[PDB]
């Protein structure tokens, strides 16, 4: 399923502090390189929150798992039936996002369909006030087997640099559970070294985000 380039489609319906928006993304992924290339468009106009705050929500099955760690790749093992991915994201001293996504193959395309709900954000906070830098730091995504639910428990803290020079933390709590009933690979503890680079197409006038992502599994 992931031997070569795979087309990707991402759909997100969001509601933050009552502000409703929709984001659509398209591109491709190459697990062999652990690379993702995607463009996202806010199809409802201006995005009410900073693009960087939606990166983690907007397909870890594209991570490059070295061959000696392939028995720890839950993400691809759950395919093509896919997995449900849910998170709660708390922005320090501000609101939180609650998301529920379904990641699976629809025809030849890997599709990530998400629903996001944001509550308790400060009107003039770093989020609703768009005070975050348009960039992204590298982070380690810690994965643990969740034997019980035959899935995984994932945790990590995102560091969003603020335009004033400070840092806006976003604690992520995520759970992944297979959509299929068959067995999947339950990994030993490990992490995904994840890198993201954000850019803009100067010719594009719609509110958008061009994203390049590099991810390699490690820890074993």
Swiss-Prot record:
Changing residue 189 to S: In EBFP1.2; shifts the excitation and emission spectra to shorter wavelengths and increases quantum yields compared to BFP. Changing residue 71 to R: In Azurite; shifts the excitation and emission spectra to shorter wavelengths and increases quantum yields compared to BFP. Photocytes. Changing residue 60 to H: In P4; leads to no detectable fluorescence. In mut2.2; shifts fluorescence lifetime from 3.03 to 1.94 ns. In mut3.3; shifts fluorescence lifetime from 3.03 to 1.88 ns. Pfam families: GFP. Keywords: Chromophore, Luminescence, Photoprotein. Changing residue 158 to V: In P9; increases fluorescence at 475 nm excitation. In R10-3; matures to the red-emitting state with excitation and emission maxima at 555 and 585 nm, respectively. Changing residue 139 to D: In Cerulean; leads to improved quantum yield, a higher extinction coefficient and is 2.5-fold brighter than ECFP. Changing residue 59 to N: In R10-3; matures to the red-emitting state with excitation and emission maxima at 555 and 585 nm, respectively. Changing residue 184 to A: In mut1.5; shifts fluorescence lifetime from 3.03 to 2.72 ns. Changing residue 162 to L: In R10-3; matures to the red-emitting state with excitation and emission maxima at 555 and 585 nm, respectively. Belongs to the GFP family. This is Green fluorescent protein. It comes from Aequorea victoria (Water jellyfish). The gene is GFP.
């Amino acid at each position: 399923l992931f031997t070569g380039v795979v087309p990707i489609l991402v759909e997100l319906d969001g509601d933050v502090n009552g502000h409703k928006f929709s984001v659509s993304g398209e591109g491709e992924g190459d697990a062999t390189y652990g690379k993702l290339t995607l463009k996202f468009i806010c199809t409802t106009g201006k995005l009410p929150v900073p693009w960087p705050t939606l990166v983690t929500t907007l397909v870890q099955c594209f991570s490059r798992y070295p061959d000696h760690m392939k028995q720890h790749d839950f993400f691809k093992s759950a395919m093509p039936e896919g997995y449900v991915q849910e998170r709660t994201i708390f922005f320090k001293d501000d609101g939180n996002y609650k998301t529920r996504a379904e990641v699976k193959f629809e025809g030849d395309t890997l599709v990530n369909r998400i629903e996001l709900k944001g509550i308790d954000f400060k009107e003039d906070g770093n989020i609703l006030g768009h005070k975050l830098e348009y960039n992204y730091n590298s982070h380690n995504v810690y994965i643990m087997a969740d034997k019980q639910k035959n899935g995984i428990k994932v945790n990590f803290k995102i560091r969003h640099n603020i335009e004033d020079g400070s840092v806006q933390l976003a604690d992520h709590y995520q759970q992944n559970t297979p959509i299929g009933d068959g067995p999947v690979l339950l990994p030993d503890n490990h992490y995904l070294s994840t890198q993201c680079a954000l850019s803009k197409d100067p010719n594009e006038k719609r509110d958008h985000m061009v994203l390049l992502e590099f991810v390699t599994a490690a820890g074993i």
